[PDB]
Design a protein around this motif. Sequence first.
Motif, PDB file in Angstrom:
ATOM      1  N   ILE A   1       1.316  -1.793   1.827  1.00 33.38           N
ATOM      2  CA  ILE A   1       1.616  -1.554   0.416  1.00 33.38           C
ATOM      3  C   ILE A   1       2.288  -2.763  -0.227  1.00 33.38           C
ATOM      4  CG2 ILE A   1       2.953  -0.145  -1.162  1.00 33.38           C
ATOM      5  CD1 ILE A   1       2.576   2.127   0.964  1.00 33.38           C
ATOM      6  N   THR A   2       3.226  -3.397   0.466  1.00 33.05           N
ATOM      7  CA  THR A   2       4.098  -4.381  -0.155  1.00 33.05           C
ATOM      8  C   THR A   2       3.400  -5.730  -0.295  1.00 33.05           C
ATOM      9  OG1 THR A   2       5.083  -4.574   2.038  1.00 33.05           O
ATOM     10  CG2 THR A   2       6.310  -3.359   0.379  1.00 33.05           C
ATOM     11  N   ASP A   3       4.111  -6.686  -0.895  1.00 32.71           N
ATOM     12  CA  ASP A   3       3.612  -8.033  -1.140  1.00 32.71           C
ATOM     13  C   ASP A   3       4.129  -9.041  -0.124  1.00 32.71           C
ATOM     14  OD1 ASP A   3       1.980  -7.561  -3.369  1.00 32.71           O
ATOM     15  OD2 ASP A   3       3.724  -7.533  -4.695  1.00 32.71           O
TER      16      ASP A   3
ATOM     17  N   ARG B   1       7.349  -6.886  -4.515  1.00 32.90           N
ATOM     18  CA  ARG B   1       7.824  -5.868  -3.584  1.00 32.90           C
ATOM     19  C   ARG B   1       7.816  -6.495  -2.198  1.00 32.90           C
ATOM     20  NH1 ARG B   1       2.832  -2.776  -4.375  1.00 32.90           N
ATOM     21  NH2 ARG B   1       2.167  -4.957  -4.537  1.00 32.90           N
TER      22      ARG B   1
ATOM     23  N   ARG C   1      -3.453  -3.482  -4.639  1.00 36.72           N
ATOM     24  CA  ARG C   1      -2.251  -3.657  -5.439  1.00 36.72           C
ATOM     25  C   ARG C   1      -2.592  -3.876  -6.904  1.00 36.72           C
ATOM     26  NH1 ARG C   1      -2.654  -5.765  -0.795  1.00 36.72           N
ATOM     27  NH2 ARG C   1      -1.031  -5.613   0.808  1.00 36.72           N
TER      28      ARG C   1
ATOM     29  N   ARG D   1      -0.739  -5.412  -9.075  1.00 34.84           N
ATOM     30  CA  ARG D   1      -0.416  -6.791  -9.417  1.00 34.84           C
ATOM     31  C   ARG D   1      -1.594  -7.712  -9.142  1.00 34.84           C
ATOM     32  NH1 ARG D   1       1.016 -11.494  -6.813  1.00 34.84           N
ATOM     33  NH2 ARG D   1       0.369 -10.384  -4.918  1.00 34.84           N
TER      34      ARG D   1
ATOM     35  N   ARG E   1       3.126 -12.982  -0.532  1.00 34.79           N
ATOM     36  CA  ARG E   1       1.864 -13.200  -1.222  1.00 34.79           C
ATOM     37  C   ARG E   1       2.028 -13.923  -2.546  1.00 34.79           C
ATOM     38  NH1 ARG E   1      -1.031  -8.704   0.477  1.00 34.79           N
ATOM     39  NH2 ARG E   1      -1.805  -9.075   2.598  1.00 34.79           N
ATOM     40  N   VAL E   2       3.210 -13.859  -3.157  1.00 34.67           N
ATOM     41  CA  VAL E   2       3.431 -14.625  -4.375  1.00 34.67           C
ATOM     42  C   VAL E   2       3.659 -16.091  -4.041  1.00 34.67           C
ATOM     43  CG1 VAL E   2       4.778 -14.774  -6.469  1.00 34.67           C
ATOM     44  CG2 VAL E   2       4.323 -12.571  -5.456  1.00 34.67           C
TER      45      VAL E   2
ATOM     46  N   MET F   1      -3.324   1.734  -5.655  1.00 32.87           N
ATOM     47  CA  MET F   1      -2.645   2.385  -4.542  1.00 32.87           C
ATOM     48  C   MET F   1      -1.898   3.637  -4.974  1.00 32.87           C
ATOM     49  SD  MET F   1      -1.104  -0.557  -2.078  1.00 32.87           S
ATOM     50  CE  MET F   1      -2.175  -1.604  -1.108  1.00 32.87           C
TER      51      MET F   1
ATOM     52  N   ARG G   1      -9.136   1.168   2.823  1.00 32.46           N
ATOM     53  CA  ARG G   1      -8.472   2.166   1.998  1.00 32.46           C
ATOM     54  C   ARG G   1      -9.389   3.342   1.723  1.00 32.46           C
ATOM     55  NH1 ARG G   1      -3.461  -0.381   2.192  1.00 32.46           N
ATOM     56  NH2 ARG G   1      -3.733  -2.625   1.788  1.00 32.46           N
TER      57      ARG G   1
END
Lengths: 460, 187, 477, 503, 81
Positions: free
Chosen positions: D339-341, D158, A182, A184, D367-368, A215, A253
């Motif tokens: 993919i997402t958080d 996300r 990610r 972020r 995750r945040v 990604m 990945r």
Amino acid sequence: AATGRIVAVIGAVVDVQFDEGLPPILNALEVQGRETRLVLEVAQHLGESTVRTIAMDGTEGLVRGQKVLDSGAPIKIPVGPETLGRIMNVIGEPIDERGPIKTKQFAPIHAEAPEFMEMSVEQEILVTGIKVVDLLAPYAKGGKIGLFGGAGVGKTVLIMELINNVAKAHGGYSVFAGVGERTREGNDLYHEMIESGVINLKDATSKVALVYGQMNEPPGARARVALTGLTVAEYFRDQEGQDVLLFIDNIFRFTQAGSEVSALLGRIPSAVGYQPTLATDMGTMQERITTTKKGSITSVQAIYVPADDLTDPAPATTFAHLDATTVLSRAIAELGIYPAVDPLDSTSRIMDPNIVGSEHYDVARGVQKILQDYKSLQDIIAILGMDELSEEDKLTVSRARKIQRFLSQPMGKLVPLKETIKGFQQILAGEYDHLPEQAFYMVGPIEEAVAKADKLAEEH
Amino acid sequence: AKLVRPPVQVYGIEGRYATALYSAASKQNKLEQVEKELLRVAQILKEPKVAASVLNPYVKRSIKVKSLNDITAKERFSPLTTNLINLLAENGRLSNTQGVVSAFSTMMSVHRGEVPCTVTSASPLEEATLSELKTVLKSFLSQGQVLKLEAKTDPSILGGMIVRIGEKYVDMSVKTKIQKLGRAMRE
Amino acid sequence: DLEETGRVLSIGDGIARVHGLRNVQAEEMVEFSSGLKGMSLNLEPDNVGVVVFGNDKLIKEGDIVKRTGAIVDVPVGEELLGRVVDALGNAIDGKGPIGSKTRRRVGLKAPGIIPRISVREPMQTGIKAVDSLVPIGRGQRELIIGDRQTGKTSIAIDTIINQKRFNDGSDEKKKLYCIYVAIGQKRSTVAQLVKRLTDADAMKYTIVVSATASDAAPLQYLAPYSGCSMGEYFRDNGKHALIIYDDLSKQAVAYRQMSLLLRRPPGREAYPGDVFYLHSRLLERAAKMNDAFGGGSLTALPVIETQAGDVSAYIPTNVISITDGQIFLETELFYKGIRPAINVGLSVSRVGSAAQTRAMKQVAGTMKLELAQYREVADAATQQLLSRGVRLTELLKQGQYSPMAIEEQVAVIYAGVRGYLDKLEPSKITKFENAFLSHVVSQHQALLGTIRADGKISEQSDAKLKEIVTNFLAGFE
Amino acid sequence: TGTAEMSSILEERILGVDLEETGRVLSIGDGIARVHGLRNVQAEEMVEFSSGLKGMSLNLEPDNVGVVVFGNDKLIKEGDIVKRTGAIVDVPVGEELLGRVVDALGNAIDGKGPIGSKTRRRVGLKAPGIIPRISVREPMQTGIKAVDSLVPIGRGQRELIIGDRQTGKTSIAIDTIINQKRFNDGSDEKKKLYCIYVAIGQKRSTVAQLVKRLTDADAMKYTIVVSATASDAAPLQYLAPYSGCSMGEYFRDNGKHALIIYDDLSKQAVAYRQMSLLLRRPPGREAYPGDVFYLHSRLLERAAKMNDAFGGGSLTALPVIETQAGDVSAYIPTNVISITDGQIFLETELFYKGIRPAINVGLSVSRVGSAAQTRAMKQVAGTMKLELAQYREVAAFAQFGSDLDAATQQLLSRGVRLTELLKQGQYSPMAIEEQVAVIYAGVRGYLDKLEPSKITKFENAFLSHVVSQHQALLGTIRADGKISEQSDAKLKEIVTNFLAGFE
Amino acid sequence: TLKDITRRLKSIKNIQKITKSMKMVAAAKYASEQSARMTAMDNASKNASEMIDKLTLTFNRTRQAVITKELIEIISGAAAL
Ligand SMILES: Nc1ncnc2c1ncn2[C@@H]1O[C@H](COP(=O)(O)OP(=O)(O)OP(=O)(O)O)[C@@H](O)[C@H]1O
Ligand SMILES: Nc1ncnc2c1ncn2[C@@H]1O[C@H](COP(=O)(O)OP(=O)(O)OP(=O)(O)O)[C@@H](O)[C@H]1O
Ligand SMILES: Nc1ncnc2c1ncn2[C@@H]1O[C@H](COP(=O)(O)OP(=O)(O)O)[C@@H](O)[C@H]1O
Ligand SMILES: [Mg+2]
Ligand SMILES: [Mg+2]
Ligand SMILES: [Mg+2]
């Protein structure tokens, strides 16, 4: 050089037809007429002077007949101490907005693994400070580690713990390869490395080089970014003599990206749809990570396990390329225990009495055994209840729960190896069977455990 | 664009290319002309040197099309057949052109109104009764039609004739009558 | 001359489509231009599919391919002992060239039915669990199957090291020459294994064939057959050989990749149709020849890596149906202290009881019966079964790289099964075991000597054993 | 063999029109037009058919172009003329879209008139890199107690809403959208959140009901609705999430904060799989193409929080995923989970047990985490979280735990109390102060006396009381973001008084 | 799902082991509550065996279906080339 033309563009696969000067496989080609640099890696020769290629960035706007120039060599990235503290993508361009990477040497990311006579046998344990890891499956200098786990078990935070502790306690020019993770989290890691002094933007004494293909990149980029990180670490080992660290997050990945390319490359799919060439390609990658007589590259690899399977072709293939694997389990992570390391699934090749010693080895085997017997007794307690069983059996269940609690480690903690084995012996022998079970949760050595017990008893 | 399809329809790359050529020639009325042209082209190619020059998968397409354009400018070939061989060199279907040639032949073979008859006998055929059977087979046709009669012999059919007119088929042989009589006495 | 010389027409991820070579034989070794060699696996009407013993970056469309005229063969002989070679027999230990005088094909046919005789003589592994409950004979194919990090390679290396006492003795027909084929291993793991074997002086009689993870898929597919031919040499020349394939799962994976890129029709899990054939014709070359053919033998110990203990996968199914038994290793027993982690309820040896020595036969019959009844029951009679079973399973544990002679195993199992350790409680047995060994090694060389010379426990030796064990149990902490 | 080796092309080629900017349809079927010519067309370039239909040049092949059609292929015949427009897809963006219902190409479908925006943006733009971002710090308030407490979402995150059919995913997204009314009605501009709802492969009646629900909640005047329904061509359902993402990236790039809901991504993956199988691309797992992870990843990576040197805006994504029989080990669930958080996982068993919103807290994650929470919610949620974790770990043995330790009994009792505490009704999103008030009344011990069946009645009565009589405390907890010691004592006073006077 | 059925099967198998062991010890101690315990644990063990049989049937069915689905994936992927 050699000039070809694009003839077909299907998703992330580009076919290029060369009049003269056919480029060998794995060569890099540059597409002319684009603002951003678009590199295509050759994959197949299809006859009639046509090659198939995987694009390193998105392929929108490509035209059938667009000129393509041949580099004459694989993807060559800048290597040297000038890459320390910078962020480069799969093709070696800086993506940190600080200017070009002015190095003296370029290195191709596709190189042969070390030979057999270059192999080293020296295995010196590296203590990291964590009770569960350093106790049950401790890390060795010069060997590949691997950190398996599903989505949400704590692999990133574990690799960040390792970055902090090891990469700061080390003097060997670490490298971090972000293989399709990610953006972020990558920005977070970059900024907290900057404010932790490991990266110095001014008067560069930096000691970590970052490589990032995230990604939203095409599959070829996420498949070759681990090779880029390898190439940087291989410079810092080969032509620098250093003992390098290589944090690869996340390696699956890489494998995953491989799958996503094979589909369009005209190749029959293998099990779970993975590619036919999974094992040997991941092998050509993972065999470059080794300790030679010139230097060592101890690699900490976070490995994504899809659906917590551990029998999927990618994790099952990676397992054999590792020297001390510690698997982060979801069932332990839902217990709130952290790190989520699976004690009955984490294996180390240096956990033998010829290397760690008889005391440490005995503590490790005793802890694993008592945890296995605890899981076994959980059957009878789930049927009847613990209040209907034997004496030493429920004493063992209590000791095993105490050990499960003491395996946790948060303020952050630093528990030295001898102190760790001391604390776990004192729990195993039963020297503190009067202290409650939740006094060992989220603490350091036995001292903070008995102290939190004192406090919790003083209030309640 | 409208296309003129021949009375017989051939299939494969051979059929597709020959159909393209026929529908090109029918718009300008040069059918037997381009027949002569492709005859000359096929006999040009069947010689071993130039054949191995065009059959080589190592010669690059520009080189082989260069040799082909040179040799077709040598024999002052019509632009139609030069374009056809250029397309066979472009699409890489060149080595198969012989079939195309043959294909086109068969196509024009039904343009002039010929039907192929094949007469098999157990004995090498005589002359008188062979002409007699030719006359008999001519009566099964419409006017403006020609017999391409080719009589080969099979001495295993034990007698009679096996005649094949197009794909119509008459089995007057004696071995089949023997098999039929055996089947009758058995069932 | 397009009949003994082709020209590469296509190349992709290990497969070369070569045009020409009209006179090449199926599965023949051809030589590319850059020096890399290949095998002609597909003979198609317009081209030849060649699998390359190297990398694709070195060959490109238009390269030349020359013909050798012989099927793939390997140098065999005595000169390979102590040497680490690759899947083609080339030395990778840097000690110079191989002084081999004989070459031998790799895909030969296994011996027939008449040249064989029953597997009768024991292959001593030096491991108590194996030598007692799952005995292996010379001429057998015993599978070593288990999950990751369960102790399979350790069993193989303990066997290879245990052969040292026979290879230093006098009788030629009790010596064993070992071969370790490493398929898909790490090069570091193979180097450390070679070091382990050199420290224990176990290289002078061992051949190591290495097809590591960085080698081409054809080399990993070929390495088991190269090792098998190297062992067939000793088998055919009256000697006795042992060969370990570590492991066959990775050879099957390499073959699957090769065939999938050769466009061969995939089957279950994308394996080719003859993936069973691939292994069967490999594991059928391990045979015991009758004395009319030299009397040699070739023992195979293939290794299989299961996923989550699934033995009904495709390749584990094949190799289980091919071999003469298997030794299951389990993680759940790995962590319960059972080491070697041999699951005995599942481990089989069809021709084992005929291989054991008479003394080990005596003690192991009782041991197997008692462990069987204990596992079946796992008051005043049943917890007797429990106690005997627990003491025996504590007697089965053993340390790494320290294989025991057969008479020492018989002594330990004899102390265990006669009831002498019914006094000591579980967490004591191990202690006693170690101490007891020292005893019977130091002052009692005559008893072990006569057990090794006679192969059985004569009643004199039985009385001596029982008086020894009671005298040691009396004065033991 | 050969797509362009048709006899017509061959005959007029050997015999003797601009084939650079124009092509001719060789074959049309199932919405995939093969076009000969168009030699200058770019990959993913949008072309125009003779009938007014548009297409997207997805397969650039040596002798033809595989174009996916944006409509019904009954209006395309073989030999039709295809023109270039020279441009990739782009949609109109701006403030003029709030309150409008558009389709996957930015055309108004609510009959309120054409869109009056001034700027357009491409749909296939790239995501912000490493440098333009900053850590997710600001809380995105959902008004759902379970989410805002245990699975907190921040601006720039996300968060995946995953679950089986009919478990409450759309309801969670709609409660989130409705909640932002309290912030968009104020004047403080840096707490306003403009919403975008992408409806992918749904009924038109469902989207009509959704627009009515948003209008009856006065939440449309700051919402955009992108609608690629079930009858729309697969390219449009493929392209709708990117149009929505561009509409939200306008807000992100210009210092405003946007939220976007893809409802859902399973149907977008299905449309992409159809287009890929009809384009003869080699199928993969479950027939899905090889680059479907690339699809969802390239989409979802555009949700980012920008630093102050890039405006300071943000874009928050809430993709929705429908699993078949609770199987999250499928292809698309695995991809979007990686993919997402974090994911808000909804159960059916939990839904019918009265636990609704049926959020499985044991399987949910963010995750945040507390970095996306206000200090008050953090103070209550840490203890609530650990309490529920212990309860669920020991709840494998409930219904009999009364025959055991007092510790297990108290864990089970506190856990049942807290699980009754997190229930919440639909279309009533609570402000954060009231959520913290309830969780305070729940976790500090003021529910061990009430049997679990009355916790809902207590929740309702307590909120009525604290909104009636204690507006100053709620206002100061809103201004402070945290429970001050004075406010702490006042909360304790209020909850003690109420539980005293409660029945 | 295969792994779910495997987990549940192992659960019921250890339950059947426990209940048959309890039947053993209850029949031992019975030599009016020990009798009820022995018969109840017998009932529990046979019921667990019935559930194990049914779950084993469903497991075999599911693993055959899994093999079929993956083979059809591989085949349809090979046929597109
Ligand atoms: N009998 C034993 N006693 C103690 N430790 C052992 C024993 N056998 C194996 N081990 C240890 O277990 C670890 C793994 O065992 P081993 O490598 O031999 O099995 P493996 O299946 O080949 O592993 P891999 O999956 O890497 O191939 C080793 O570190 C080894 O030291
Ligand atoms: N928190 C809730 N309380 C009560 N009912 C609820 C709640 N959430 C959802 N529901 C109800 O559950 C039903 C299904 O919820 P919803 O349609 O919003 O979820 P969904 O996952 O989008 O379902 P679908 O698969 O049809 O799209 C609705 O009738 C809704 O009213
Ligand atoms: N010290 C901590 N306190 C609370 N939660 C933590 C802590 N360390 C890690 N976590 C949690 O660990 C979980 C896993 O995060 P991450 O490392 O991204 O997982 P993975 O890398 O395994 O996918 C997150 O939900 C995170 O909040
Ligand atoms: Mg991660
Ligand atoms: Mg091994
Ligand atoms: Mg819905």
